[PDB]
Each structure stands twice: as C-alpha cells, then as structure tokens.
Amino acid sequence: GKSKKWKEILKFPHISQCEDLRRTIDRDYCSLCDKQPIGRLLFRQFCETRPGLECYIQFLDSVAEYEVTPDEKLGEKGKEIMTKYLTPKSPVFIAQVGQDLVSQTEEKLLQKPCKELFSACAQSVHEYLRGEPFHEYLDSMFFDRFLQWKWLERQPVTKNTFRQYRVLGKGGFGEVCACQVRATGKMYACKRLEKKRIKKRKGESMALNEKQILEKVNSQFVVNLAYAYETKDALCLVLTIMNGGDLKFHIYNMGNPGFEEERALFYAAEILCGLEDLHRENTVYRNLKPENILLDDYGHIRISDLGLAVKIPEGDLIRGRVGTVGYMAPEVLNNQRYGLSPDYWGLGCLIYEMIEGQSPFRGRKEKVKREEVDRRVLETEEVYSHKFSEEAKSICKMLLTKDAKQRLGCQEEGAAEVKRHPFFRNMNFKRLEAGMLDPPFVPDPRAVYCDHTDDDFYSKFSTGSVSIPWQNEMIETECFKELNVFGPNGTLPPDLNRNHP
Numbered sequence: 001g002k003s004k005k006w007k008e009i010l011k012f013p014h015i016s017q018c019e020d021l022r023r024t025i026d027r028d029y030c031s032l033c034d035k036q037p038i039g040r041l042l043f044r045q046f047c048e049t050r051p052g053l054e055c056y057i058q059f060l061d062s063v064a065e066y067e068v069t070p071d072e073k074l075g076e077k078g079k080e081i082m083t084k085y086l087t088p089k090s091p092v093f094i095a096q097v098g099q100d101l102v103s104q105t106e107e108k109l110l111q112k113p114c115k116e117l118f119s120a121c122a123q124s125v126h127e128y129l130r131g132e133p134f135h136e137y138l139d140s141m142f143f144d145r146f147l148q149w150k151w152l153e154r155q156p157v158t159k160n161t162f163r164q165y166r167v168l169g170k171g172g173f174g175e176v177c178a179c180q181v182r183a184t185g186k187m188y189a190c191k192r193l194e195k196k197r198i199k200k201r202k203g204e205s206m207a208l209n210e211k212q213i214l215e216k217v218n219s220q221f222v223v224n225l226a227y228a229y230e231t232k233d234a235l236c237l238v239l240t241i242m243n244g245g246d247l248k249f250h251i252y253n254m255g256n257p258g259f260e261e262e263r264a265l266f267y268a269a270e271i272l273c274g275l276e277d278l279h280r281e282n283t284v285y286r287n288l289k290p291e292n293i294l295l296d297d298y299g300h301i302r303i304s305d306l307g308l309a310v311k312i313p314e315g316d317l318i319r320g321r322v323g324t325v326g327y328m329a330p331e332v333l334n335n336q337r338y339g340l341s342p343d344y345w346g347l348g349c350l351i352y353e354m355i356e357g358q359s360p361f362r363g364r365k366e367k368v369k370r371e372e373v374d375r376r377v378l379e380t381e382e383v384y385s386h387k388f389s390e391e392a393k394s395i396c397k398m399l400l401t402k403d404a405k406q407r408l409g410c411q412e413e414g415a416a417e418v419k420r421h422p423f424f425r426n427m428n429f430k431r432l433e434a435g436m437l438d439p440p441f442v443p444d445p446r447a448v449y450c451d452h453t454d455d456d457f458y459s460k461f462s463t464g465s466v467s468i469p470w471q472n473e474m475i476e477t478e479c480f481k482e483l484n485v486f487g488p489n490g491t492l493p494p495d496l497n498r499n500h501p
C-alpha cells in the first residue's frame with residue numbers, strides 16, 4: 001500500500017548533495033557496516049564484488065548459523081564450516097585468520113562443541129575487514145549510495161509523511177492511533193501527546209525523557225521509536241504497532257486464568273531480554289505489570305509504556321515512589337534510593353502471575369485495600385502451588401526477595417545471573433534473541449483482542465526519523481531492494497556520477 005509516486009518521494013539525491021554528510025558522518029566500522037542495517041547491507045554488497053572478500057562474509061554468515069544451531073547438531077555444523085572455510089585448499093579458503101588459529105579451532109572441535117567455537121576466528125575476520133577492506137569501501141560507490149540513503153533518512157518528517165487511521169488506544173496526556181507511512185506503507189502506532197495538557201501539567205521533561213529513552217533503546221522486546229515529529233495541537237511519537245493484545249487479557253480472559261509453566265517461561269524469557277536491553281542503557285522501567293506487556297502479530301511480546309522509565313546516571317541512585325498498586329517493589333514503597341532492582345521484582349510478580357493466575361499478594365477473588373496489599377508486599381512471604389515446578393518456585397522466590405541487595409539479578413552480573421537460573425534451563429537464549437523459537441500463542445490476523453520557551457522544547461523533541469528503525473523500515477517494505485540499483489554490469493548509475501548531474 002505504497003503511495004502512487006513513492007519512487008519520486010524516496011528518489012535518491014545526486015551524490016553531489018551529500019558532500020556535507022560525507023565530511024560529518026563518523027567513519028566508524030561497527031556503525032557503518034554492522035549496526036546501521038542499510039550500511040551493513042551495502043558493505044556486504046561491496047565485499048560481494050571482490051573474489052577475495054566474498055568468502056569472509058560467507059564465513060560470518062555460517063558462524064551466525066552455528067551459534068543458533070541445536071546442541072545435538074553442533075558437531076555436524078561445526079565440521080562443515082571447518083572443512084569448507086578453514087582447510088588450506090578451499091575455493092572459499094580464508095587466509096587472514098592465522099593458520100595458528102585454524103589449528104587451535106580444530107582442537108575445540110576434537111572436544112565438546114560450544115556455541116562459541118568460531119568466536120575467535122570471527123573476531124580475526126572482523127579485524128581484517130575493519131582495516132583495508134573498510135577503507136576501500138569508503139572510497140566506493142556503495143558508500144556514496146549509503147550517503148544518499150542517509151540524506152533521505154534525515155529529511156524532514158511532517159503530518160503529510162503519515163496517514164493516520166483509527167484510534168486504537170487511549171490514555172492520560174492523549175491517545176494512541178494507528179498510522180501508515182504513505183511512501184513505504186509500513187504500519188506504526190502514533191502516540192499523540194496534546195500540547196495543551198503538556199504545557200498545563202508542565203510535563204515537558206517527562207515527555208522528552210520518554211522520547212529519549214525510546215529512541216536510544218534498540219531492542220526486539222521493547223517498543224522502538226521510529227519517528228518523533230510535531231504538529232498543530234499535538235506532538236507525536238511513532239512506535240511499533242502491536243496488534244496481538246496485552247498479557248493481562250491473555251492471562252485472565254484467555255487463560256485458566258494463568259498459563260502452563262512452559263508458556264509463561266517463553267514470555268518471561270522475552271521480558272527478561274527486554275529488561276536486559278533497557279539495563280544496557282542503565283535505564284529502569286518501574287512499570288512492569290501484565291497490561292504493559294503487548295503481543296505482536298507473530299505472537300512475540302514487547303514491553304510498552306516507558307512513560308515511567310528513567311535513565312539512571314551511572315554510579316548514582318534515584319528516588320521515586322511511582323508505579324501501579326501491587327507492582328511496586330519494597331524499596332519503592334519505602335521511598336528509598338534504588339537502582340534497577342524494582343524491575344527484577346516486577347519480573348517475579350509477572351512470572352508468578354502468569355503461572356498462578358493471580359497476583360502474589362492479592363487474590364483474584366479477593367477484595368482488599370491498597371494499604372493491606374502494601375503491607376503484604378513488605379512483610380508477607382508469598383505462597384506457591386503445584387502449578388509451580390521447584391525451579392519456578394525458586395526463581396519467583398529469588399526475584400521476590402524483599403531485600404533489593406539479595407534479589408536475583410541485582411548484583412554486578414545483572415540479568416545474566418537470571419538467565420543462568422535453573423528455571424530457564426531448557427531455554428536457548430541465542431535462538432530466542434534470533435527469533436527462532438515459535439511463540440506459544442499466535443493471534444489471528446483478523447482478531448481484535450480488546451510562547452517562546454515552548455518553541456525551544458519542541459526543537460529538542462521533534463528530532464525526526466530515528467536511524468536504525470528508519471533503515472529497517474526501508475528494508476522490510478522492500479523500498480531498499482527496489483531503489484538500490486546501479487548501472488548494468490557493475491558501473492556507475494547516473495545519480496552517482498558527478499559528471500552529468
């Protein structure tokens with residue numbers, strides 16, 4: 001459902017228009033050839049023109065495949081890779097990996113295989129490519145084409161950039177609509193923030209902080225910000241659309257109430273990966289409750305409503321009695337200086353609630369006052385049923401430790417400590433982070449599961465498209481596949497030749 005003339009909207013600018021970009025973009029290898037999707041694809045395409053470099057890209061692809069390979073199939077896929085890329089006589093032999101290291105990798109194959117057997121060789125390969133091949137790519141037509149894609153990426157976004165549809169959510173400071181990009185046809189969820197209520201409540205810093213946290217998170221298990229733009233009578237936040245409903249609905253309306261332990265394990269693993277991604281940017285969520293975990297069309301989950309999140313300064317603690325009744329950790333109720341620990345408390349509350357079909361401190365069929373719920377959270381120890389395996393009891397108990405200092409995942413090791421827990425013993429996180437494990441519930445497509453100071457504030461909010469989400473949008477809609485064309489037989493196309501603009 002792309003606009004009639006979408007090819008004219010995303011028409012590449014002549015390379016001569018990107019000179020200012022050329023001398024401004026930081027020529028970082030990991031950014032330009034890995035993190036940025038379109039840059040990664042273009043660098044791989046450059047390597048696909050050189051017999052010498054092709055084999056290294058193929059190798060890294062096969063290593064990526066090996067990491068997610070099932071355990072029983074590791075020794076097989078290992079040998080393959082070996083006898084194909086690392087034997088001296090191979091049409092795809094890679095030499096820049098020291099023969100030394102080849103004879104050291106054979107060893108680890110001669111013993112038990114691990115999912116990290118080729119990490120050494122892959123790092124060697126990246127070191128090779130970070131050098132001469134990268135700098136050649138920089139003086140290549142593929143990097144010019146990357147600059148053209150960057151130019152498009154930075155263009156101003158407006159209301160006309162989008163095509164708003166239906167109001168599919170509501171809230172406090174505004175509402176949540178569904179909006180499509182006319183040029184690409186990709187669907188998103190607009191979060192419309194009414195400028196009036198924001199000026200009144202003086203919530204400038206809160207809306208801004210939410211926008212910054214959303215734009216700086218790049219996770220498969222949290223809602224991503226794609227665009228932040230302004231209009232008349234509102235500001236907008238364009239985020240991941242989630243049409244599969246929320247976890248509260250599936251626990252209570254579609255549940256027993258509750259789930260089988262294994263289904264809850266899938267969801268808990270995905271939520272833990274989301275929290276890990278948030279903790280990499282030392283950001284604390286503090287709003288972990290089942291209605292804020294959303295499902296997508298494929299059955300996977302993402303954390304939503306970051307309006308309560310806070311970027312914690314490293315080495316510093318914050319204070320704030322915020323959240324939802326019944327999902328506030330003890331240190332939060334006591335209004336103490338805390339760190340990321342509230343979130344792990346939340347995680348516990350969710351696993352419990354997923355398995356048992358009720359909160360650990362309030363019965364589903366119970367009617368109590370906020371004060372008694374809080375007293376239970378601070379003094380009462382929760383009880384477990386036969387719906388919990390011993391491992392599940394364990395992880396819930398450790399996450400529901402009242403002393404944030406002794407709570408699982410609140411050490412310097414972080415979420416890793418939780419991923420190792422016996423509760424997750426049958427969970428391959430490499431395959432989950434790669435999207436390779438089938439979700440336990442797949443929603444049906446057709447389903448429906450429900451002044452001048454202000455000017456300066458807007459300037460810092462309405463920053464336009466976000467880089468990684470924009471490029472991923474371009475790829476998913478096949479805009480990139482369609483426009484990324486060159487000259488017949490590996491030659492310069494007109495938009496990249498400086499001779500005849």
Ligand SMILES: Cc1[nH]c(/C=C2\C(=O)Nc3ccc(C(=O)N[C@H](C)c4ccc(F)cc4)cc32)c(C)c1NC(=O)CCl
Nearest residue numbers: 168170171172174175223241242245304305448449450
């Ligand atoms: C169609 C649809 N949109 C959504 C919603 C989202 C979504 O998809 N991504 C999202 C990312 C973030 C937020 C978010 O921060 N909200 C906060 C609390 C908020 C704040 C102020 C306000 F004024 C309104 C909302 C919401 C969503 C859902 C679940 C469905 N799904 C169904 O309704 C099942 Cl039929």
